[PDB]
């Protein structure tokens, strides 16, 4: 089908980062994942920040509107949908901080239905085209099995809702998936695939502060000359997924819009101590703050990896440049993969230095993106302004 362009919009971005949904170049994406909803012990899914999500008024949002109305970033996401009919939005549930919360609701049938019903409720009230589940990660086979059951329960609730509105759209079920063999090898990949529209493979965080040696954090291919610099590779993951029965065109390659740093290092693949500063938190740098003054950039086109290194501070930052992004685009194209996904929208550069723009153009452009109309009708929404299509 065409290629997908998937981005994570993080709801805490509206604070210190100053990134609002209005700043998204909507025409370069097919799918926005709104992160992150949290999970109650009952299985009930709920919004993590009602201020950012529903309450904050933006310019254009009236104070005096009749009826029960939604504002926040949810309204802004619907506005984007109205204006770009090829743009779909999904409610992303879980993520790193919240993943502890999956195990208990997921272990029972009651828990699983509460999850499914409450997530569907959120979807149809807030105007989303589907839900994305990011359990990072199922610790073992039991959990992996429960996760398959969780997916089934959600897929049934979705379909049941579509059945209630035969002429309306179908809805999406998506997940973020592991690139590390020790995590994906315990999942029942072929089983899960039956329920999903597509797989956003988290092909990044291959290295970080948790290691003892500086490594490439999102490279495609392993290094034969320096194996220590590539603990992982996305190619290993993609190939294993396909062997397990997952179709290449349903796998979306996750790409970092940030870099991880290593301090007091002689270079890639050597020991390091500490991670230095960061754009917002230590050890992590936004792509848009790169390159750092005094750092030299090295591009390993063959393994598709890049990093900066400042000889004087002995500081290493593993992150992708435009060159390397075009190389990952190459890879998506060559292997007929489902598209590109990025974490996350606040940190890309604009214009010709944008990693997202580089990949979309390397995919043949916006015309080669999957064309699938989003859903604007939400007749069962509790929110007046949304079910009326945000007339205002």
From Swiss-Prot:
Site (Transition state stabilizer): 134
MF terms in GO: chitin binding; endochitinase activity
Activity vs pH: Optimum pH is 6.0. Active from pH 4 to 8.
Domain GH18: residue ranges: 3-366
Protein name in the entry: Endochitinase 1
Gene behind this protein: CTS1
Sites carrying sugar chains: 352
Keyword Transmembrane in record: no
Annotated PANTHER family: CHITINASE (PTHR11177), CHITINASE 12-RELATED (PTHR11177:SF317)
EC primary class: hydrolase
Family of the protein in this entry: Belongs to the glycosyl hydrolase 18 family. Chitinase class V subfamily.
Any GO BP: polysaccharide catabolic process
